[PDB]
């Protein structure tokens, strides 16, 4: 169905789109087209589903079971009205309460959904994308929404293609189609058309794809809504999975809980049939048990956690795409960091140089006045010539009246620094671009590690084209066969290579990036003037070049970085630098920001100290280490495993992007969760494979900021730290609540089982059970979410998902075998005191149901020889049920402040949460209000309480309080742990 | 699958876990029994902590109710044995050989006496004296009543009882022509019981009014009460009354209500057993 005009020639493209091959478009015209077609962002869907979506959430589980139970209650009440005459309210009330619970739950989940979606919507507009258009002959980095149809647009590697373009000029440009093809493989891009099909041809770039490598420039054939790709981004697109660790353990818990609640359910239904209860009562009992063992609250709780973390991330500017991933970030036991742009601020100005076996400097003040060595030397003229010609960046439009240091530049940090330094120290770079006409070009690739240009011979005595090339100083040193000395060539010596290395140490030691520079006055006889040049095929010799010299600029880390690394290494998170920059530079930066600490010598430092060859030094004797990319290339999986495992502080240097990838994968080969922080396009493969990816929103590329799970809109590295901290809290808070809810279960289930063992009068009722499970688990389980991380300071190092989850099998042992049991024996005690206080000694109480539950036998005798009627001893009964509710409410206090803190005693945590206190007080108020309102003895069978009955419960709750802090004090004193290994949440 | 040996099940000894649990649970049980025995402070063996819940006593019956109903035929001994064995079982404790001299029984008046209080609830005295009730009291209706027998010609006797609430003293109401018309009821020391059947608008008057007991008075004498508890007064015996319908129109069920009027006694709405005694009577052939 797609149509196109790609077949149309560049001059027919000229006439059709009235633009310019290189001069770009008129600003006036660009505003006219902007006013004509409107912003080039796809008109969004509806919303799509509005607030009616809340209905589904109101319908859905876990409340679904509450809904089935409620409708089963109303059904039961209808059946009870039909059969026999029944004054009792029974269910009815029950189904009402259940429905109300569901509705309230829905309000919660919808509220937290509202906050979370407001945040996630603000995050989309916090950072707008941008496009590099060409207008008035000059380049502009304008907003991505302001690109018009038919203006020229450049798209270096690492950028998203801002609209659908017809490539009129490109070099080595491999774009990634990704979504349009479904293929991860990059596809080359040239001005020539190859297929009638617009999707497969190479002259057509399209929206929502990104240029992996090389450079290109094209006229915008399609803007905004009506782009070739613009149909699938809304007509079929959506959220595409899949799994999230914390959420996965969440669902696993849900399946487990469902399983136990239904097993107990049917089991207690057969017990009901053996108890000879009526079906009308047996189903209500079933509903009771199920609604009991199943935490409604886990869901709303989770939503709470998510929303909270979202607010907190909103406050420190770090965007997270996937909320759950924040937890993943906490679980990180190894951060892999790129150096330039990441640990550093990717802002640079040239400080030092090296030519003619001499160290020169460039003044950085104002000034710049950077020579300071010899403005007249010829070797500086060649150096400056390379630095200017080989540089691809230029100043942005309307920037000429500003100081060179202070004007806006379109290019990477290195080339920008060069640009400013030549434009200031020597002369106008643009003028020397125009002087030395660039005939053919090689794009810059990280993979390639170098960049070079071939320009004409404007000089009268250069009787041929001139090649220039800058890059990794070592590749340059390799490729050369001679060096310029005072303007006169001279082959490479041992002396020259030694001075090169010594100067590289001297300048790299200051943590300065060391760009190497060389050139080649090509042999005349070898080629004529109109010789065809080949970028795809290497027709041009890269060897035997003429070395010129070195240039270095100071690279300052961001302020927060050393502190961040400090916190993470304080966090038991291994910090590992992975850069393709200089081995010496990355070592220095590492020492600086604390990836490598003093006193931890590398093998080479040891070889220096001990005056012995590096190979003689025991590699295990060594703490830290730096790995050269070349060594990495020849690494077996096993040897990387070794380096990674046996060395504490690790810095990878000279690494290819795939080597970043393999590094991360080696960290994943250890079983460890890894984070990846970066900026560059070449970070993307590394930050993809990661368990959690982080990228600069400013300094980052479009590809790597796409790929990442977390974007720092403020470029603040420290945001990672709080990030992981949040992720602990989530993993921490959730677990806490879980603990609490389970402790509610045992004392709800036990009475029906003790019921079987001896004919002991009913200690609680179904209505009493739901009373507990609703008053005692709605508010509190949610309130747990609001607690801050105790100490928490983890380090204690992040726990393996394999070691312990959100639902530890150990958690259930002190949740059921410890707390639950106590709440239970408390309940049974209070019940025995009630029944004792009414003439029925506890010893007398077993064997009673035989006549107790018997309706027509009113001759029941107690220990004091009193004859009780059915309705009297039943009143007594419901007055034993009522406190069991109240009493567990009393004991649930303890559990709340116990689950409030996992680590340090509840005194070190503080009271903090108002929702927790709110939970205590409104739990108690619900108890009271349930027991003393009129008609409650009839409605929910809740007969009012004798004052003493409230006090009965206390001892046990105190046993809880004491025990768990005897516990927490044992954690405190010893980490060896006996219970740490048995009763840790 | 649970791997073995190298794992040794889910872990090797693994003894101190079981030990920490039998220790902690024995501790928690020590706290449970501890709390159970301190609350066994306790309550005086002489009285329940709270009588308020026993309320005014409900009105009980001896021919053991099935569903508060009685349906049977004369012809089958088995038809009535269901009520016979229960009436004989209950009245086994009332045998004249069971009531004996040499304590704790002492004869009390054939004529119904004054409120007899054995003393304080304290245990300064031993096993306190208990007035005994001979089977001869309930009777009349030509020849004999009890123990039972069950002839159709009318009905077999329906014996009626009152709950034995600890230390309860029965109060007969004073008046001048109460809502009830209890016939052979003397004003003091009486506990009135009278039977009316099936609502008010449709009395149907299907049952004739005849009752009998101590002094031939159709109610309870205040000479037995108050009870001093199964502890202070084991082998005590409770006052006994008998309700007998001479006519009961064959082959029909008919609800009848035995109210026990008084200030001390109270009717409950939802408890049909409290302060009154409802029963469905139906004899058939």
């Amino acid at each position: 169905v797609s149509m196109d005009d790609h077949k149309l020639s560049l001059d027919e493209l000229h006439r059709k789109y009235g633009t310019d091959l290189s001069r770009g478009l008129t600003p006036a015209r660009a505003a006219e087209i902007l006013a004509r077609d409107g912003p080039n962002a796809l008109t969004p869907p509806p919303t799509t589903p509005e607030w009616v979506k809340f209905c589904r959430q109101l319908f859905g589980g876990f409340s679904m079971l509450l809904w089935i139970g409620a409708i089963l209650c109303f059904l039961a009440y209808g059946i009870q009205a039909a059969t026999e005459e029944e004054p009792q309210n029974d269910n009815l009330y029950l189904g009402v309460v259940l429905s109300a619970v569901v509705i309230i739950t829905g309000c919660f989940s919808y509220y937290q959904e509202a906050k979370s979606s407001k945040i996630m919507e603000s995050f989309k507009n916090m950072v707008p994308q941008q496009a590099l258009v060409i207008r008035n002959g000059e380049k502009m980095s304008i907003n991505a929404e302001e690109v018009v149809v038919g203006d020229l647009v450049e798209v270096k590697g690492g950028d998203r293609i801002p609209a659908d373009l017809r490539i009129i000029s490109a070099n080595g440009c491999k774009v990634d189609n990704s979504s349009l093809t479904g293929e991860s493989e990059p596809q080359t891009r040239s001005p020539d058309f190859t297929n009638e099909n617009p999707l497969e041809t190479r002259n057509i770039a399209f929206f929502s794809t990104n240029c992996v490598e090389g450079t290109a420039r094209g006229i915008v054939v399609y803007t905004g809504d009506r782009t070739v790709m613009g149909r699938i981004a809304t007509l079929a697109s959506g959220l595409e999975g899949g799994q999230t660790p914390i959420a996965a353990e969440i669902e696993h818990f849900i399946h487990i809980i469902t399983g136990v609640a239904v097993f107990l359910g049917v089991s207690f239904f057969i017990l009901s049939l053996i108890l000879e209860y009526t079906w009308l009562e047996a189903v209500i009992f079933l509903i009771g048990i199920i609604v009991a063992n199943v935490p409604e609250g886990l869901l709303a709780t989770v939503t709470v956690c998510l929303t909270l973390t979202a607010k907190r991330m909103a406050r420190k500017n770090c965007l997270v795409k996937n909320l759950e991933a924040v937890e993943t970030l906490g679980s990180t036991s190894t951060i892999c960091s790129d150096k330039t742009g990441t640990l550093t601020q990717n802002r640079m100005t040239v400080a030092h140089m090296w030519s003619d076996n001499q160290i020169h400097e460039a003044d950085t003040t104002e000034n710049q006045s950077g020579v300071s060595f010899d403005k007249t030397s010829a070797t500086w003229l060649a150096l400056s010539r390379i630095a200017g010609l080989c540089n691809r960046a230029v100043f942005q439009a309307n920037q000429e009246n500003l100081p060179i240091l202070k004007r806006a530049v379109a290019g990477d940090a290195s080339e920008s620094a060069l640009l400013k330094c030549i434009e200031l120290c020597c002369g106008s770079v643009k003028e020397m671009r125009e002087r030395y006409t660039k005939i053919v070009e090689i794009p810059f690739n990280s993979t390639n590690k170098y960049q070079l240009s071939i320009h004409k011979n404007p000089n009268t005595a250069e009787p041929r084209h001139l090649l220039v090339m800058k890059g990794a100083p070592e590749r340059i040193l390799d490729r050369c066969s001679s060096i310029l000395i005072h303007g006169k060539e001279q082959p490479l010596d041992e002396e020259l290579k030694d001075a090169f290395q010594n100067a590289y140490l001297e300048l790299g030691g200051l943590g300065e990036r060391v760009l190497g520079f060389c050139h080649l006055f090509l042999p005349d006889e070898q080629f004529p003037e109109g010789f065809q040049f080949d970028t795809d095929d290497v027709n041009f010799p890269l060897d035997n070049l003429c070395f010129v010299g070195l240039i270095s600029m100071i690279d300052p880390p961001r302020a927060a970085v050393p502190d961040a690394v400090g916190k993470c290494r304080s966090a038991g998170i291994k910090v590992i630098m992975v850069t393709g920059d200089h081995p010496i530079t990355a070592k220095a930066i590492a020492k600086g920001v604390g990836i490598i600490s003093e006193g931890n010598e590398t093998v080479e430092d040891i070889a220096a100290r001990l005056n012995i060859p590096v190979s003689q030094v025991n590699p295990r004797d060594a703490k830290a280490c730096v790995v050269h990319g070349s060594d990495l290339k020849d690494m077996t999986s096993e040897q990387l495993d070794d380096i990674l495992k046996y060395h504490t502080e690790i810095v990878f240097a000279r690494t290819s992007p795939q080597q970043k990838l393999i590094i991360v994968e080696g960290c994943q080969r250890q079983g460890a969760i890894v984070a990846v922080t970066g900026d560059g396009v070449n970070d993307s493969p590394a930050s993809k494979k990661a368990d959690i990816g982080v990228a600069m929103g400013i300094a980052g590329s479009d590809v790597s900021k796409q790929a990442a799970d977390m974007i720092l809109l403020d470029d603040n590295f420290a945001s990672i730290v709080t990030g992981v901290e949040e992720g602990r809290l989530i993993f921490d808070n959730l677990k806490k609540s879980i603990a609490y809810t389970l402790t509610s279960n045992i004392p709800e289930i036990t009475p029906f089982l003790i019921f079987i063992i001896a004919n002991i009068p009913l200690p609680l009722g179904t209505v009493t059970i739901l009373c507990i499970d609703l008053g005692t688990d709605m508010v509190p389980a949610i309130s747990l979410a609001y607690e801050q991380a105790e100490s928490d300071i983890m380090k204690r190092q992040p726990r393996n998902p394999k070691t312990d989850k959100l639902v530890n099998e150990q958690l259930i042992s002190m949740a059921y075998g410890q707390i639950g049991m106590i709440q239970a024996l408390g309940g049974f005690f209070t019940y025995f005191v009630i029944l004792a206080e009414n003439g029925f000694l506890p010893i007398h109480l077993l064997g009673l149901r035989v006549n107790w539950d018997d309706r027509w036998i009113n001759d029941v005798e107690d220990s004091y020889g009193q004859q009780w009627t059915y309705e009297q001893r039943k009143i007594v009964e419901f007055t034993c049920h009522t406190p069991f509710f109240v009493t567990i409410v009393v004991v649930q206090w303890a559990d709340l402040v116990i689950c409030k803190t996992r680590r340090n005693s509840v005194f070190q945590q503080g009271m903090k949460n108002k929702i927790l206190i709110f939970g205590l007080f409104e739990e108690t108020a619900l108890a009271a209000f349930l027991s003393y309102c009129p008609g409650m003895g009839v409605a929910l069978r809740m007969y009012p309480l004798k004052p003493t009955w409230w006090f009965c419960a206390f001892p046990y709750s105190l046993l809880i309080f004491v025990y768990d802090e005897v516990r927490k004090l044992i954690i405190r004193r010893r980490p060896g742990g006996w219970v740490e290994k048995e009763t840790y949440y | 699958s649970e791997k073995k040996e190298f794992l040794g099940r889910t872990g090797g000894s693994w003894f101190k876990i079981l030990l920490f649990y039998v220790i902690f649970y024995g501790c928690l049980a020590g706290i449970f029994i501890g709390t159970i025995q301190v609350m066994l402070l306790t309550i005086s063996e002489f009285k329940p902590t709270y009588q308020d819940r026993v309320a005014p006593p409900g009105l009980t019956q001896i021919p053991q109710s099935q569903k508060t109903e009685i349906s049977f035929r004369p012809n089958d001994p088995q038809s009535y044995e269901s009520y016979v064995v229960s009436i004989v079982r209950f009245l086994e404790k009332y045998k004249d050989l069971a009531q004996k001299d040499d304590m704790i029984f002492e004869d009390c008046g054939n004529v119904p006496s004054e409120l007899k209080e054995r003393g304080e609830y304290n245990n300064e005295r031993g096993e306190r004296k208990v007035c005994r009730s001979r089977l001869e009291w309930l009777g009349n209706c030509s020849g004999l009543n009890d123990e039972t027998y069950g002839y159709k010609d009318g009905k077999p006797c329906v014996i009626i009882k009152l709950n034995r609430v600890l230390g309860f003293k029965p109060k007969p109401p004073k008046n001048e022509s109460l809502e009830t018309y209890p016939v052979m009821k003397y004003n003091p020391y009486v506990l009135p019981v009278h039977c009316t059947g099936k609502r008010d608008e449709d009395k149907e008057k299907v049952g004739t009014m005849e009752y009998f007991g101590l002094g031939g008075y159709p109610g309870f004498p205040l000479q037995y009460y108050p009870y001093y508890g199964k502890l202070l007064q084991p082998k005590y015996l409770q006052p006994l009354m008998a309700v007998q319908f001479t006519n009961l129109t064959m082959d029909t069920e008919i609800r009848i209500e035995c109210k026990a009027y008084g200030e001390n006694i109270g009717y409950s709405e939802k408890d049909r057993f409290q302060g009154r005694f409802d029963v469905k009577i139906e004899v058939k052939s």
Binding site: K914, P944, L945 | -
Partner: peptide, 27 residues
């Protein structure tokens, strides 16, 4: 036991507990 009295006490209590809840909640 008794009646009215503990019903009232419990009632005023529920009221105070609940007011406390709102008060702490609105802080």
């Amino acid at each position: 036991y008794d009646y009215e009295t503990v019903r009232n006490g419990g009632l005023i209590f529920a009221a105070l507990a609940f007011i406390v809840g709102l008060i702490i909640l609105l802080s």
